[PDB]
Amino acid sequence: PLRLPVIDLSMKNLKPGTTSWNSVRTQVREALEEYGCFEAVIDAVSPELQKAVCNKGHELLNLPLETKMLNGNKPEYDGFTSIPNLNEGMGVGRITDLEKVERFTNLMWPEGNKDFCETVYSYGKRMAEVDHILKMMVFESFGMEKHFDSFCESTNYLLHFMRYQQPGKDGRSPALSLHKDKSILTIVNQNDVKGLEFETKDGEWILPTADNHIVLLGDCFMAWSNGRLHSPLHRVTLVANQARLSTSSFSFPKDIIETPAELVDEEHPLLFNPFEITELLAYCFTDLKQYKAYTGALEHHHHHH
Ligand SMILES: O=C(O)CCC(=O)C(=O)O
Numbered sequence: 001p002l003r004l005p006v007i008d009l010s011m012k013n014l015k016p017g018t019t020s021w022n023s024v025r026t027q028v029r030e031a032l033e034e035y036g037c038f039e040a041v042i043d044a045v046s047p048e049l050q051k052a053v054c055n056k057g058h059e060l061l062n063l064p065l066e067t068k069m070l071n072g073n074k075p076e077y078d079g080f081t082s083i084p085n086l087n088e089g090m091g092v093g094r095i096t097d098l099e100k101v102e103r104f105t106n107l108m109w110p111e112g113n114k115d116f117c118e119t120v121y122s123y124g125k126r127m128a129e130v131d132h133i134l135k136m137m138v139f140e141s142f143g144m145e146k147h148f149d150s151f152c153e154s155t156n157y158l159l160h161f162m163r164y165q166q167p168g169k170d171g172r173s174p175a176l177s178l179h180k181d182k183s184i185l186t187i188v189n190q191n192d193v194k195g196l197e198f199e200t201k202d203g204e205w206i207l208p209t210a211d212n213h214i215v216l217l218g219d220c221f222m223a224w225s226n227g228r229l230h231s232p233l234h235r236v237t238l239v240a241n242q243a244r245l246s247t248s249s250f251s252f253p254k255d256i257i258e259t260p261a262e263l264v265d266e267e268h269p270l271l272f273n274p275f276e277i278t279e280l281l282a283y284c285f286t287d288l289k290q291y292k293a294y295t296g297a298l299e300h301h302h303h304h305h
């Protein structure tokens with residue numbers, strides 16, 4: 001039976017230069033290269049805070065439709081979205097910018113919701129640190145440390161909630177359609193109800209238990225790596241008659257993604273020209289190889305030798 005790799009991202013392993021850092025970095029690179037994702041033990045967020053954030057997601061999605069639509073009409077990022085009688089969701093954009101979070105909260109709760117603002121801000125900052133460390137490890141695994149600071153400058157962070165109503169039956173109930181994330185990295189907590197399901201390169205399906213966090217790679221990181229890392233296709237399939245809420249943390253570049261020249265060679269021709277993340281996100285709501293950034297070049301496994 002297939003299971004995603006299980007990687008220990010506890011804070012005790014996340015000190016640079018230590019042997020535990022190096023062994024986790026090796027595992028992270030291998031998992032992101034073969035699966036594009038892995039189960040993760042993450043203790044940057046306490047169980048209490050993780051549960052509180054879950055409640056804030058239910059509190060937010062419980063608001064009236066016209067209130068949630070105050071968050072705007074960009075469902076590719078933070079805007080409210082809904083498939084009738086199936087799922088709904090929105091995000092808190094720029095979750096690491098306290099001024100933005102306060103603004104969002106005042107919009108949703110004009111009378112004030114202080115525990116909401118403090119809870120999601122604390123969660124987003126903690127999950128941004130994990131995201132930061134993971135990217136630092138990936139860059140080290142490619143010898144690309146000299147590009148790391150510039151890549152991380154003004155990273156945009158998103159806290160996103162997806163809720164799926166009770167399907168009313170046992171067995172498999174499709175709940176979110178297949179896609180790749182357009183993030184750099186995405187960190188997912190399933191809040192004790194599994195459903196997130198990944199396709200492997202070989203066309204098998206892996207549905208993790210809800211034991212651990214899930215880290216998965218988005219198209220932005222795939223493209224930065226010149227396709228050396230895999231961004232996995234994934235969907236949601238409920239497998240029990242219970243509602244589900246997921247908490248997700250996305251990182252997006254300041255603006256432009258560009259493949260380092262050092263990640264291009266004779267066997268790895270440049271797959272993607274530079275592109276703007278906001279243009280791409282809006283394009284997908286009107287496979288990155290389908291976007292205008294694709295050069296037409298052959299992937300590595302198609303190199304002619
Ligand atoms: O609800 C989930 O776990 C999946 C959500 C997801 O994949 C996404 O919003 O991109």
Ligand SMILES: [Fe+3]
Pocket residue numbers: 179180181234
């Ligand atoms: Fe996704």
